Amino acid sequence: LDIESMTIEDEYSGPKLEDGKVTISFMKELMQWYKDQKKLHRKCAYQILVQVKEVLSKLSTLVETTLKETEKITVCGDTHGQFYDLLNIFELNGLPSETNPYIFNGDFVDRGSFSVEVILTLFGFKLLYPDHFHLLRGNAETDNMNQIYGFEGEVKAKYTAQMYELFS
Amino acid sequence: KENYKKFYEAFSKNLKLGIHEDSTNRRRLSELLRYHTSQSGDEMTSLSEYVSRMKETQKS
Ligand SMILES: [Mn+2]
Ligand SMILES: [Mn+2]
Numbered sequence: 001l002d003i004e005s006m007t008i009e010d011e012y013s014g015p016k017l018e019d020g021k022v023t024i025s026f027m028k029e030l031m032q033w034y035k036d037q038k039k040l041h042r043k044c045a046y047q048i049l050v051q052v053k054e055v056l057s058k059l060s061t062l063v064e065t066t067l068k069e070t071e072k073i074t075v076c077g078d079t080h081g082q083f084y085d086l087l088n089i090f091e092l093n094g095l096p097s098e099t100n101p102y103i104f105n106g107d108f109v110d111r112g113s114f115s116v117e118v119i120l121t122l123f124g125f126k127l128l129y130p131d132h133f134h135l136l137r138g139n140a141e142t143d144n145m146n147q148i149y150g151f152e153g154e155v156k157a158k159y160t161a162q163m164y165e166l167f168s
Numbered sequence: 169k170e171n172y173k174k175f176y177e178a179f180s181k182n183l184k185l186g187i188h189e190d191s192t193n194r195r196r197l198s199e200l201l202r203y204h205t206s207q208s209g210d211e212m213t214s215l216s217e218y219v220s221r222m223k224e225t226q227k228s
Contacts, residue, residue, distance in 0.1 A: 003209050003210065006207070006209065008207070008208070008209045008211075042209075042211075157170075160210045160211060161210075162210050
């Protein structure tokens with residue numbers, strides 16, 4: 001919060017992020033220069049991540065839900081983070097878009113080069129689609145998983161170490 | 169710079185020793201120095217970059 005409120009830099013050539021509840025058009029933009037393989041600016045990556053954290057820290061201490069009748073399940077099991085896999089699930093189904101229940105029940109953050117990027121967009125979608133978008137712990141999302149498959153150091157190169165501490 | 173931070177993380181101490189020992193190189197060796205500062209957040213900025221943000225009234 002302090003780092004963002006200090007605005008060390010504010011915005012970047014790719015993203016245009018809002019203060020909170022980033023538009024679906026900007027979530028789309030963010031995905032389509034993950035095709036281009038660009039990154040968020042550190043302040044704006046923190047800005048979404050602290051807001052995501054706050055929302056997740058308020059949300060029910062463990063989740064039980066009555067699912068509604070006409071709505072169609074999309075599930076991912078493990079999807080060890082890859083940008084083509086994100087494109088390919090947007091072939092497999094339409095957009096989650098508060099329109100279909102979208103459960104990400106997987107290892108996502110590990111064993112693929114694009115793995116912080118997968119959670120960066122999926123966390124955005126969870127802020128914008130809260131009620132029937134549910135993102136469940138893999139085992140491989142846990143702390144030590146990132147040491148054994150290097151993600152801890154892969155983030156540390158991509159961004160300074162505090163980013164990886166926030167993701168942990 | 170994406171590699172420079174790996175080099176500086178490994179060999180920063182040697183680089184400081186140069187500033188201590190080489191009276192001839194040190195003026196040019198300092199420019200390779202990186203530090204945290206209050207306004208540099210969790211990133212290290214060069215001493216020359218520090219001046220770029222220096223206030224009009226600072227002498228130091
Ligand atoms: Mn797995
Ligand atoms: Mn697993």
